[PDB]
UniProtKB/TrEMBL annotation:
Entry EC no(s): 2.3.1.97
Family statement: Belongs to the NMT family.
List of residues binding CoA: H2, F4, W5, V161, E167, R169, A171, T193
Stated name of the protein: Glycylpeptide N-tetradecanoyltransferase
EC class of the enzyme, as a word: transferase
Species of origin: Leishmania major
Length: 411
C-alpha cells in the first residue's frame, strides 16, 4: 500500500512502533564513501537546482511555489502563505547547509516544479522516561541509554510538488535526493511532521485554535456561530464578547526580548525542555536566531524585573490564503512557539500572548497539543480543530509517546 515508504528505513506499522523498547537506528550502518556523489536520476526534461536562500530572486521563486501549491487545511478552504522573510528565517538558521535546500526545475523554461528543505537540528531523541523504567527491571539499561546524548540531525520541511505535477511520483524522488545530500554530510537521521498519516508516527497531536477576531473568522468560514448564541438577538455580539480580551497585558514586567536576554532565555528554556522525552538543544546563536523578534515573522516577550528574566513566550506568523477567486482575505494566524514560565502560572503567561497577538492584529492563535499546551486550553478558550500533526523520524526506531512528551515546535 506504500510503494515508496515500504522501501525506507522507518517503522512500517503501528504495532511495530508500539513494541519498540529502545531508541536507535534502523538501517544498515554506512559511511559517506558508501553514498553516491552523483545526484539521484531524474527525467531529462528536469534538473536539480540548489536555490541560494539569501538571493532575492531565488527566495521569490520558492515563495511563489509555496503560496500557490503548499499545505491546505483538511477542508481545502485555506492554504499556507509563508512570507519570503519567514522562509529565509526558517531555512537559514546557524550553520545551515545550503546543499540541503533542494529544488526541481523544468529545463526548458526554468519553471520551479518542486522543493524540499532540510536544516540542522540538535535533538534529544534517546529512549523515553516510561521506557527506561521497564528496561531497568529487565536490567538492559545500557542498550536503553546508548543514544541519550543529543544528536546533530536533519529537520525536513517545505516538501512541495506543483499542483500540475501531482501523483507522478516526484515526491519520492525529492526525498531520496535530500536523503543522499544529508547522508553525504555523515548525518543519518531526520525528524519531520505532517498533517497526513504516513508510516509511522512516534507521536500525534490535535491542533487547537483560539479566536481573536471572531467576526473575520466567521466571514472567511474558519468559524461558525455557536448554536447557543444563535438563540439571541445579536449572536455576533455574544460571540465577540466571549472572545474579548484586554487591549494590553496587566502583567507587569513584559517587554520584547532583546539580544542581552539571550543567555537567560536559553537557560530557562533548556531547563524546561529537558523535562520532555524529545526536544531540541539550542546554542546561544540558535536562541538568538529562533527567538529574537523579527518584524512580521517571530514575536517574543520576556517578563523581566530588575534585569532578571523569569519568563518568556514566543509566537510566529503564518497567514493563510483564503482560497477563492478574487478573495484577498487572509487568515492572519499566530502560532504558539517556545515559552517558559517560572514566576507566573503558564495560563497567565499565555493569556499575555493572546493579548499581544490580538493587539498586533492577529485573527486566531493556533497550536498543537505538545509541551504543556493542553494545560491552558479550557480557561483560555482554545478549541480543538479538525487537523492532527503527526511526528516522524527517518532511520530511527522510537517507542510511541504522547504529544505532551514532545518539545520540538516545527514551523
Ligand atoms: C537522513 C536524511 C533523511 C531526510 C528525509 C527524511 C524523510 C522526509 C519525508 C518528507 C517530510 C516532509 C515534511 C513536510 O514538508 S509536510 C508538508 C507536505 N507538503 C504538502 O502537503 C504540500 C501540498 N502537497 C504536495 O505538495 C504534494 O501532495 C506532496 C509533495 C506532499 C506529495 O506529492 P504528490 O501528492 O504529487 O505524490 P507523489 O505521487 O509525488 O508521491 C506519493 C508518495 O508521497 C508520499 N507522501 C505524500 N505526502 C507526503 C508527505 N507530506 N510527506 C512524506 N511523504 C508523503 C505518499 O505517501 C506516497 O508514498 P507511498 O505511500 O506510495 O509510499
Ligand atoms: C489555519 C490553517 N491553514 N492551513 C493551511 C492549515 C493546514 C490550517 C490548520 C491548522 O494547522 C496547524 C495548526 C497548528 F497549530 C500547527 C500546525 C498546523 C499544520 C497542519 C498540517 C500541516 N502540514 N504541514 C505543515 C507544516 N509543517 C508543520 C510541517 C502543517 C501544519
Ligand atoms: Mg508527483
Amino acid at each position: 500500500a506504500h510503494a515508496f515508504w515500504s522501501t525506507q528505513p522507518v517503522p512500517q506499522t503501528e504495532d511495530e512502533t508500539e513494541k519498540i523498547v529502545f531508541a536507535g537506528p534502523m538501517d544498515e550502518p554506512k559511511t559517506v564513501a558508501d553514498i553516491p556523489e552523483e545526484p539521484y536520476p531524474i527525467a531529462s526534461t528536469f534538473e536539480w537546482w540548489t536555490p541560494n536562500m539569501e538571493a532575492a530572486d531565488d527566495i521569490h521563486a520558492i515563495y511563489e511555489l509555496l503560496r500557490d501549491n503548499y499545505v491546505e487545511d483538511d477542508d481545502s478552504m485555506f492554504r499556507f502563505n509563508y512570507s519570503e522573510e519567514f522562509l529565509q528565517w526558517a531555512l537559514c538558521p546557524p550553520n545551515y547547509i545550503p546543499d540541503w535546500h533542494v529544488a526541481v526545475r523544468r529545463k526548458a523554461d526554468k519553471k520551479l516544479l518542486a522543493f524540499i528543505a532540510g536544516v540542522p537540528v540538535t535533538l534529544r531523541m534517546g529512549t523515553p522516561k516510561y521506557m527506561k523504567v521497564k528496561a531497568q527491571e529487565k536490567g538492559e539499561g545500557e542498550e536503553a541509554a546508548k543514544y541519550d546524548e543529543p544528536r546533530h540531525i536533519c529537520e525536513i520541511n517545505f516538501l512541495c510538488v506543483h499542483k500540475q505535477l501531482r501523483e507522478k511520483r516526484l515526491a519520492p524522488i525529492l526525498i531520496k535526493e535530500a536523503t543522499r545530500r544529508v547522508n553525504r554530510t555523515n548525518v543519518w537521521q531526520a525528524v519531520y511532521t505532517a498533517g497526513v498519516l504516513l508510516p509511522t508516527p512516534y507521536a500525534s497531536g490535535q491542533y487547537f485554535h483560539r479566536s481573536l477576531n471572531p467576526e473575520k473568522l466567521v466571514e472567511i468560514r474558519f468559524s461558525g456561530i455557536p448554536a447557543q448564541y444563535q438563540k439571541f438577538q445579536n449572536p455576533m455580539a455574544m460571540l465577540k464578547r466571549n472572545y474579548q480580551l484586554p487591549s494590553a497585558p496587566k502583567n507587569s514586567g513584559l517587554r520584547e526580548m532583546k539580544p542581552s536576554d539571550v543567555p537567560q532565555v536559553r537557560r530557562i528554556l533548556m531547563n524546561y525542555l529537558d523535562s520532555f522525552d524529545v526536544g531540541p538543544v539550542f546554542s546561544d546563536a540558535e536562541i538568538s536566531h529562533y527567538l529574537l523578534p523579527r518584524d512580521g515573522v517571530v514575536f517574543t516577550y520576556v517578563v523581566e524585573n530588575d534585569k532578571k528574566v523569569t519568563d518568556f513566550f514566543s509566537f510566529y506568523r503564518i497567514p493563510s490564503t483564503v482560497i477563492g477567486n478574487s478573495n484577498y482575505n487572509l487568515l492572519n494566524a499566530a502560532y504558539v512557539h517556545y515559552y517558559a514560565a517560572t514566576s507566573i502560572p503558564l495560563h497567565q503567561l499565555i493569556l499575555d500572548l493572546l493579548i499581544v497577538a490580538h493587539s498586533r492584529g492577529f485573527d486566531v492563535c493556533n497550536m498543537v497539543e505538545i509541551l504543556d499546551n493542553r494545560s491552558f486550553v479550557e480557561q483560555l478558550k482554545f478549541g480543538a480543530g479538525d487537523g492532527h500533526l503527526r511526528y516522524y523520524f527517518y532511520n530511527w526506531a522510537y517507542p510511541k509517546i504522547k504529544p505532551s512528551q514532545v518539545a520540538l515546535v516545527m514551523l
